[PDB]
Amino acid sequence: LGNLFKSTNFQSGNTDLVILVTPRVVSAASLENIRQVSQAVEMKDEYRNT
Amino acid sequence: NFGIITGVLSTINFALSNGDAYLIANPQLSARSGGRTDFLAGGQVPILQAL
Known part of the structure; x- marks a missing residue:
């Protein structure tokens, strides 16, 4: 019953953050470059089909 | 002319607060x-x- 004679203000929250990196010695034929090249091909095909 | 004119006033307080962080x-x-x-x-x- 005391809530009829009382007012409450409540705040709560949290933030999570991670930053991580990965270096690799590559060439133009390396897997890291090939995947990005193939991603661009799919981007062009998706544009063409709309 | 001899006399007086005076009075009093008042205010009531019952405030109560709490805070945590x-x-x-x-x-x-x-x-x-x-x-x-x-x-x-x-x-x-x-x-x-x-x-």
Whole structure:
């Protein structure tokens, strides 16, 4: 019953953050470059089909 | 002419308040010996600062 004679203000929250990196010695034929090249091909095909 | 005119006034107070606040900040960094690392998790506000 005391809530009829009382007012409450409540705040709560949290933030999570991670930053991580990965270096690799590559060439133009390396897997890291090939995947990005193939991603661009799919981007062009998706544009063409709309 | 002799006399007096006077009076009193009053105010009643029954205020009552409480407050709590908690915070923990746990940032973690990595750096190499002889190097330096800086980290910011927040914002920026504009300030007028001219010669």
